[PDB]
C-alpha cells in the first residue's frame, strides 16, 4: 500500500548517527584551501561563548524595503583570550591520507597545558615535559634536527595552540589544546613563523576582522535522552491512544523483517558536533580597549557586558568576537571560529557594516537600564548612602 498522502520526512539522515561528541572541544574537520601567496597566518581561533545581546544597525541593502534603515538583530559574543602557541606538528601526504611524522613542542610550557595532561593534577609530581625541556641544554641539535625534518618533508604544517583559560571568568584552570593550519606560502616560512612564535600571544586583531564571514564549529547543548517527538519532530498521536501518545506509531512494514535505520527512534538529543557557516562578524573588540560598547553614534563609555554580567558566564574584560545571529553551542563552551572555505560573493556577504547601538541591559531580567549611571539618573537617590 502507498502512503495515501505523501509527506516530507522527519529529521535529516545526514546528521546520523546522533551519538554524543568525543569531547566538548569539537574537532575542526577541514580548514580553508591553501594558496602559497598569502602572508603567513592562522586559519582558526578558539574562544568561549559568552551569551547573546541585541544590536541596532543601519541596514544598507540596495533594492530592499529597509534600505538605509534601522533594524535590530541578535549577536552572540564569543570571548577571546589571546591564544598562545606552544608547538607545531607537520603531516606528510601519504597514500593513506596525511600522517603526522613529527611534532615539536616549545621550550617552557605554561602550567595550563601542563595541567591538560593530568586527570589528577593535585596528586602529581608535576613532571610534564621535563626530559623534553632538557633538550635545550646544548645549542638544540635534536630540536633543530626535528625542525629540519619538518622543513624537508611535510606538505602541511599545523600548530598546537591553547587558550589562556585563567584570563576568563570561567572556573576551570585547564586549557584546551588544539591544532590550527596555516595559510602562508613555502612551509619553511610557516615553520620559521612557528619557531619565532613559540610562547607568544596571538590576538584576534590579526586573524579575523570586521565584516568577514566566518564559520563556527562547536558542540551542541546537551538535553540528554529524548523522546521521539521533540527529537525528530514526529506528530503526536491523538488523545485516545492506549500505550503512549508521544511516539512514532508505525515502525515499519512486515517485510523488511527488521527495523530500518531511517525510522525515528528515541535517543540522545544534543551534544553533537555542529558547524554553521557564513556568520558575519560585527565587532572585533579588545580587552585593553576601554568602552567596548560605545559606537560612533553612541559614544557613551560602557562595555558590552550587561549590568550584573552575562548570565552564567561573567564579565568580559578580554578580547571578543561579536558575531551576527545564533551559533551552535551554549555558553561556556569551547567554540572554534574558522575562516571561510570559499570566497563568498553573495551581496549578503561583502556588506561592510558598522553598528549603531549595542544592548547592554541586564540579561537576568527585563533590563530597564543599560548603564548604572543611567539608573542613578532615572530612579534617583534611594534609602542608601545619601
Amino acid at each position: 500500500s502507498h502512503r495515501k498522502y505523501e509527506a516530507p520526512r522527519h529529521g535529516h539522515l545526514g546528521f546520523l548517527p546522533r551519538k554524543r561528541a568525543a569531547s566538548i572541544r569539537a574537532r575542526v574537520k577541514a580548514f580553508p584551501k591553501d594558496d602559497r601567496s598569502k602572508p603567513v597566518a592562522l586559519t582558526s581561533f578558539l574562544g568561549y561563548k559568552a551569551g547573546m545581546t541585541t544590536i541596532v544597525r543601519d541596514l544598507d541593502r540596495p533594492g530592499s524595503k529597509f534600505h538605509k534603515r534601522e533594524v535590530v538583530e541578535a549577536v552572540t559574543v564569543v570571548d577571546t583570550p589571546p591564544v598562545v602557541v606552544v608547538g607545531v606538528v607537520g603531516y606528510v601526504e601519504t597514500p593513506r591520507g596525511l600522517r603526522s611524522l613529527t611534532t615539536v613542542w616549545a621550550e617552557h610550557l605554561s602550567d595550563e597545558v601542563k595541567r591538560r595532561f593530568y586527570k589528577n593534577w593535585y596528586k602529581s609530581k608535576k613532571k610534564a615535559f621535563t626530559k623534553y625541556s632538557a633538550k635545550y641544554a646544548q645549542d638544540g641539535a635534536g630540536i633543530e634536527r626535528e625542525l629540519a625534518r619538518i622543513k624537508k618533508y611535510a606538505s602541511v604544517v599545523r600548530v598546537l595552540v591553547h587558550t589562556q583559560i585563567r584570563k576568563t571568568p570561567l572556573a576551570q584552570k585547564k586549557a584546551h589544546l588544539a591544532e590550527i593550519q596555516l595559510n602562508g606560502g613555502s612551509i619553511s616560512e610557516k615553520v620559521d613563523w612557528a619557531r619565532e612564535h613559540f610562547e607568544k600571544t596571538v590576538a584576534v586583531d590579526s586573524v579575523f576582522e570586521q565584516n568577514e564571514m566566518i564559520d563556527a564549529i562547536a558542540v551542541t547543548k546537551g538535553h540528554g535522552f529524548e523522546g521521539v517527538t521533540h527529537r525528530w519532530g514526529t506528530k503526536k498521536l491523538p488523545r485516545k491512544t492506549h500505550r503512549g501518545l508521544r511516539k512514532v506509531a508505525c515502525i515499519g512494514a512486515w517485510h523488511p523483517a527488521h527495523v530500518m535505520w531511517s525510522v525515528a527512534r528515541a535517543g540522545q538529543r544534543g551534544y553533537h558536533s555542529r558547524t554553521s557557516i557564513n556568520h558575519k562578524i560585527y565587532r572585533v573588540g579588545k580587552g585593553d580597549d576601554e568602552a567596548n560598547g560605545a559606537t560612533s553614534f553612541d559614544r557613551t563609555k560602557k562595555t558590552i557586558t550587561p549590568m550584573g554580567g552575562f548570565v552564567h558566564y561573567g564579565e568580559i574584560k578580554n578580547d571578543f568576537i561579536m558575531v551576527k545571529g545564533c551559533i551552535p553551542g551554549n555558553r561556556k563552551r569551547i567554540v572554534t571560529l574558522r575562516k571561510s572555505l570559499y570566497t563568498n560573493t553573495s551581496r549578503k556577504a561583502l556588506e561592510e557594516v558598522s553598528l549603531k547601538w549595542i544592548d547592554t541591559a541586564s540579561k537576568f531580567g527585563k533590563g530597564r537600564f543599560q548603564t548604572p549611571a543611567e539608573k542613578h539618573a532615572f530612579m534617583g537617590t534611594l534609602k542608601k548612602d545619601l
Binding site: 498522502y5 541596514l59 529597509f66 533594524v71 535590530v72 506528530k235
Partner: protein
C-alpha cells in the same frame, strides 16, 4: 502575497487559519468574513493554510447584506491581533482581526475603510492605502 500584488512583504506571523471570522472593516456592507483559504499559501500534510496581515484570502461572508452572502470572494486582511515582528524591533498587535473585500486585482469593493490599517498591508496593496485611514 500572490499574483496581482505590488511589492514583496517580509514574513509576518500567521495567526489566522482556515475558518477564522474577521470583523470586516469597510463600508461595503459585509459585517464579517470567513477565511476559506489563503492566496499564495503552500501545502503540508495536515497543516491549515494560515492568513496574516496584508495577505489576500479567499473568504465568504456570514452576515450583512444578503446580496453579499453565499458567495466566495477575494479579501484582504488589514489588522491581525497576533503579534508579528517588524524588522525595526517591535512585536506589535492590533485590538482585533479585520478584513476588506477585494477583487482579484486589489480594488476595494467598498469605498471607505474604518479604524487602523497596518502599514505592511498598505504598502503591498495600493488601492487599500488610498482608501485607508490610519496607517500603522
Amino acid at each position: 502575497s500572490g499574483n496581482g500584488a505590488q511589492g514583496t512583504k517580509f514574513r509576518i506571523s500567521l495567526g489566522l487559519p482556515v475558518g477564522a471570522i474577521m470583523n470586516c472593516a469597510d463600508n461595503s456592507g459585509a459585517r464579517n468574513l470567513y477565511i476559506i483559504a489563503v492566496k499564495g499559501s503552500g501545502s503540508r500534510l495536515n497543516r491549515l493554510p494560515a492568513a496574516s496581515l496584508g495577505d489576500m484570502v479567499m473568504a465568504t461572508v456570514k452576515k450583512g447584506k444578503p446580496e453579499l452572502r453565499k458567495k466566495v470572494m477575494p479579501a484582504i486582511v488589514v489588522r491581525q491581533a497576533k503579534s508579528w515582528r517588524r524588522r525595526d524591533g517591535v512585536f506589535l498587535y492590533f485590538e482585533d482581526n479585520a478584513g476588506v473585500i477585494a477583487n482579484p486585482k486589489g480594488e476595494m469593493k467598498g469605498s471607505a475603510i474604518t479604524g487602523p490599517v497596518g502599514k505592511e498591508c498598505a504598502d503591498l496593496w495600493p488601492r487599500v492605502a488610498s482608501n485607508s485611514g490610519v496607517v500603522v
